[PDB]
Amino acid sequence: SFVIRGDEVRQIAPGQTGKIADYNYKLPDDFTGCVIAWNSNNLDSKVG
Amino acid sequence: YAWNRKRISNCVADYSVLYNSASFSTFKCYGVSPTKLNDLCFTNVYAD
Amino acid sequence: SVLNDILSRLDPPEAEVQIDRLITGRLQSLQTYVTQQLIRAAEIRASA
Amino acid sequence: SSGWTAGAAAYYVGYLQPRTFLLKYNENGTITDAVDCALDPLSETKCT
Amino acid sequence: YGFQPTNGVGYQPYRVVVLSFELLHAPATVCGPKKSTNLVKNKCVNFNFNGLTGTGVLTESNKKFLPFQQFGRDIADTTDAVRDPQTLEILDITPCSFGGVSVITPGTNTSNQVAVLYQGVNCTEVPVAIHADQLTPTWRVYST
Amino acid sequence: AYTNSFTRGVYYPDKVFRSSVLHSTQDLFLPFFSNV
Amino acid sequence: AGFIKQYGDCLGDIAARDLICAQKFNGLTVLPPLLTDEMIAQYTSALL
Secondary structure, eight states, X not given: OOOXXXXXXXXXXXXXXXXXXXXXXXXXXXXXXXXXXXXXTTTTOOXX | OOOOOEXXXXXXXXXXXXXXXXXXXXXXXXXXXXXXGGGOOBSEEEEO | OOHHHHHHHSOHHHHHHHHHHHHHHHHHHHXXXXXXXXXXXXXXXXXX | OOSOOOOOOOXXXXXXXXXXXXXXXXXXXXXXXXXXXXXXXXXXXXXX | OOOOTTTOSSSSOOOOOOXXXXXXXXXXXXXXXXXXXXXXXXXXXXXXXXXXXXXXXXXXXXXXXXXXXXXXXOXXXXXXXXEOSSSOOEEEEEOOOOOOEEEEOOOTTTOSOOEEEETTXXXXXXXXXXXXXXXXXXXXXXXO | OOOEEXXXXXXXXXXXXXXXXXXXXXXXXXXXXXXX | OHHHHHHHHHHHOSSOSSOXXXXXXXXXXXXXXXXXXXXXXXXXXXXX
């Protein structure tokens, strides 16, 4: 489970490359699973 | 419609700085991985 | 058409697709060659 | 075109066309001969 | 377009620079940086000349290259030879020694002993391909 | 007035060296036996 | 032939180093015949 950014979500997938995809988390090419994403602005977005 | 073309040649290129810039929203390369780009040498590079 | 180029050119996730094109094709060519040889060899063995 | 004129001279001009050619490289890498492929049916045979 | 200053989601200017890569008959004008190493001859090495990568043995050649010609090719459409970007010297590239390996053995019922055949190779190279020098003495016996 | 430009107008198609080989290429050349 | 002839040239070179022709360049090798040409003559001489 992650805190990743919205524009970033694309990166949690097999082939992609990018900031998170390289340094933070790397899904394998062969990945067998699902990627479930839902923005939780309410839970963690405070003023400031 | 007017698109400008610039000719770049006779030098050495550091593309990694371009890749390692947070500044570009989209950096998609068709044919080169953005990394390992430093390894290539070309006759003429055109920038639009 | 050059394997070393593709390797130098693309990261694995993308490169795998391109190389695959060559392998299926090249192998098919090699397959074609072998079939020709077997048939041709039969002719020669017939002569032998 | 008045006044005095220069000594006799002749120059020629012809037009290039997209055509196929079979070039013969010598040992040196010198081009000794060539075949205009389209020129005639004989020349076409040389091409194949 | 107009691009309302604050407004555009899709509406904003995306300054797009596109790099087009062209390789021609000619020598590379723009090339990657730093690493001109000492050229080594008569040894199997990996080599990269102006981006042309491959493995082989670089030897001085007696080809008559014309002053304009960058490099040559074989029938295979593979690099036959190159001229150094640093030094105007001509080098023929012969791929490093290799060949098939076959095991000549009597029946296993008969014996374990074996004899190895290295196809189409001079006996000199057996230590070379193997990198016998690196190995333990147990291995070395086999080399030569 | 025209003259027979028999064979001329051939040039090295590229920068690449080749030797003892018959190679085919396509470029803009002067067609053989064309009027000049 | 282009390739085959090129291969023969390969056998010619004493000077070249690390020249194992079997490799031609891409794994294509030529195995020698079991009965050498000299031997073949002896059979024929015997057959004669």
